[PDB]
Amino acid sequence: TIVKPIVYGNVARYFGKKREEDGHTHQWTVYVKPYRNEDMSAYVKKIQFKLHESYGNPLRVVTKPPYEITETGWGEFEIIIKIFFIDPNERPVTLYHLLKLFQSDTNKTVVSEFYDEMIFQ
Amino acid sequence: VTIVKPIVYGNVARYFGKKREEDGHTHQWTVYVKPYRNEDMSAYVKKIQFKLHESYGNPLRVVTKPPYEITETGWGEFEIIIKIFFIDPNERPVTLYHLLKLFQSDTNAMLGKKTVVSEFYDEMIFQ
Amino acid sequence: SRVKGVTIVKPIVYGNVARYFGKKREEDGHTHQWTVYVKPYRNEDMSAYVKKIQFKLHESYGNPLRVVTKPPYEITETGWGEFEIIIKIFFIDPNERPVTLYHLLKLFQSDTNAMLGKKTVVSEFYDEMIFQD
Amino acid sequence: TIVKPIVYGNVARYFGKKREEDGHTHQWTVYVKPYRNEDMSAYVKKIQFKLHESYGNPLRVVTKPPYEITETGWGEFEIIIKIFFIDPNERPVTLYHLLKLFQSDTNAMLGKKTVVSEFYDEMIFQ
Amino acid sequence: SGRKAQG
Amino acid sequence: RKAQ
């Protein structure tokens, strides 16, 4: 049994104002990264980030680090993150992340991220 | 694999805009023990105790699953006693001492560094 | 190589730091300054057992083979591109072949770290050198 | 049989405007630190920084990390750094550092605003 | 170009 | 001893 730790989540920052063309208010980046520095592409084939249906190209795919997608928007929504491995017979792992744009009860740049573990062999 | 297990430990800290009026806190900080490599430290670590300053409630904080980190706010620097307990009952606990750093050095302030990092190194060997 | 003397293990970190100029330099198109390095894991003198460390750069560099014979074992350069550096660590003459490491030079800051305002890009790894005392 | 690598030197930044109240033009910080981070105070008792005689209080002493001294001024001069050890049997080590304030002509075109002058050395015990 | 990448 |  091999366990590879990861952290996933997003950063976001409010624009100055609401942008008039599209009503977007925030820039954000959603990501998966190793907990400590390592090249995950040795065992990760691709990571797909499924965005809200209001986006054109809701299914974004990253094949090389950094595994991150940057966009702008105006509302929060759930992103489905699916990690595909080079090894066949190795089930992809699926993560669910609520994209955070607005500051929380307890806390410039908003950060919402979580520790997780990928289990192998 | 690796012959010895390298670890890093210490803390990061971030200054608030200003002093928070309610409690006079000025910084958020996170004290930690991590493997250097991207590996599962819980394979050999059972729990890690972080003994905080007496001004904190429940100052003996225990973390039993990764990540081995405690995040708090504060206003002064103090020594944290870190005690690492191991899965193997024959491995004696290891005690580390760390001065929680909040204040950026003048050198690092003159460079662009907004985050305070105070990180130290150790190595463990397991049969 | 035939083993002469006692085999020992020395932990190291290696890799690079880099910083963006903030604009592309017109004379050569360079955009970043970077330093590639090998350091002992703890604060100790590596020159006691390291004879020299060679850093082999991409052929777009005028002298691609940089040799450092005294600490600190580092090379600072500027450039525009990310590429693999071949690092060869040679030990004092009880022994013969070098340890070879490969390091992908990292220059370009992630979007995440850019939004966090982090100024320096760092890519560092651990290894253990095994050689004869 | 103990060698402890260190780095020493200074950073400096131009004021932007020449301060007329005293003629100083730069802020600077001189420092000593272990090459790989460690508890240097375990073996260092104090570090003395001796400044130019144009400073009031030219002797500055630091006894805990960070081993650094911050000042302002207008000129480059040689700082004398004396490192004293916990062991009274260990003679102090003296380092000399030329304070750097003015930036190279390379480094405007690169795009840096802070001057750094830094050197590697090694402290040897018996 | 080649084994060297811009970004 | 002291310059510029």
From Swiss-Prot, chain C:
Query: Primary place of residence?
Result: nucleus
Q: What is the effect of changing W80A?
A: Impaired binding to histone H3 diacetylated at 'Lys-14' and 'Lys-27' (H3K14ac and H3K27ac), and subsequent deposition of histone H2AZ1/H2A.Z into specific chromatin regions
Could you tell me which residues belong to the region Diacetylated histone H3 binding? 80-84
**Transcription found in the keyword field:** yes
What compartments host this protein?
Nucleus
| Protein's UniProt keywords contain Transcription regulation | yes
Q: Which GO terms label this protein's molecular function in UniProt?
A: histone binding; histone H3K18ac reader activity; histone H3K27ac reader activity; structural constituent of cytoskeleton
Please give the positions of the paired cysteines in each disulfide bond.
none
GO terms for cellular component: NuA4 histone acetyltransferase complex; nuclear matrix; nuclear membrane; nucleoplasm; nucleosome; nucleus
Report the protein's function.
Answer: Chromatin reader component of the NuA4 histone acetyltransferase (HAT) complex, a complex involved in transcriptional activation of select genes principally by acetylation of nucleosomal histones H4 and H2A. Specifically recognizes and binds acylated histone H3, with a preference for histone H3 diacetylated at 'Lys-18' and 'Lys-27' (H3K18ac and H3K27ac) or histone H3 diacetylated at 'Lys-14' and 'Lys-27' (H3K14ac and H3K27ac). Also able to recognize and bind crotonylated histone H3.
Official protein name in the record: YEATS domain-containing protein 4
State the taxonomy lineage. Answer: Eukaryota, Metazoa, Chordata, Craniata, Vertebrata
Q: Which gene encodes it?
A: YEATS4
Which residues of the complete protein appear here?
A: 15 to 146 of 227
Swiss-Prot record, chain D:
**GO biological process, any:** regulation of cell cycle
Q: Where is this region: Diacetylated histone H3 binding?
A: 74-78
**Localization per Swiss-Prot or TrEMBL:** Nucleus
Q: What is its main location?
A: nucleus
YEATS domain span? 1-126
- Domain of life where this protein originates: Eukaryota
Marked site positions, Interacts with diacetylated histone H3: S54
Q: Which UniProt keywords apply?
A: Chromatin regulator, Coiled coil, Growth regulation, Isopeptide bond, Nucleus, Transcription, Transcription regulation, Ubl conjugation
An example of a GO molecular function for this protein is: histone H3K27ac reader activity
Q: Where is this cross-link: Glycyl lysine isopeptide (Lys-Gly) (interchain with G-Cter in SUMO2)?
A: K18
Q: Which GO terms describe its cellular component?
A: NuA4 histone acetyltransferase complex; nuclear matrix; nuclear membrane; nucleoplasm; nucleosome; nucleus
> In which tissues is this gene expressed?
Expressed in brain, heart, kidney, liver, lung, pancreas, placenta and skeletal muscle.
How would you summarize the oligomeric state and partners of this protein? Component of numerous complexes with chromatin remodeling and histone acetyltransferase activity. Component of the NuA4 histone acetyltransferase complex which contains the catalytic subunit KAT5/TIP60 and the subunits EP400, TRRAP/PAF400, BRD8/SMAP, EPC1, DMAP1/DNMAP1, RUVBL1/TIP49, RUVBL2, ING3, actin, ACTL6A/BAF53A, MORF4L1/MRG15, MORF4L2/MRGX, MRGBP, YEATS4/GAS41, VPS72/YL1 and MEAF6. The NuA4 complex interacts with MYC and the adenovirus E1A protein.
Function according to Swiss-Prot or TrEMBL: Chromatin reader component of the NuA4 histone acetyltransferase (HAT) complex, a complex involved in transcriptional activation of select genes principally by acetylation of nucleosomal histones H4 and H2A. Specifically recognizes and binds acylated histone H3, with a preference for histone H3 diacetylated at 'Lys-18' and 'Lys-27' (H3K18ac and H3K27ac) or histone H3 diacetylated at 'Lys-14' and 'Lys-27' (H3K14ac and H3K27ac). Also able to recognize and bind crotonylated histone H3.
Q: How does the record comment on the protein's domains? A: The YEATS domain specifically recognizes and binds acylated histones, with a preference for histone H3 diacetylated at 'Lys-14' and 'Lys-27' (H3K14ac and H3K27ac).
Q: What protein name does the entry list?
A: YEATS domain-containing protein 4
Q: What phylogenetic lineage does the species belong to? A: Eukaryota, Metazoa, Chordata, Craniata, Vertebrata
Q: Gene encoding this chain? A: YEATS4
Q: Which residues of the full protein are shown?
A: 20 to 145 of 227
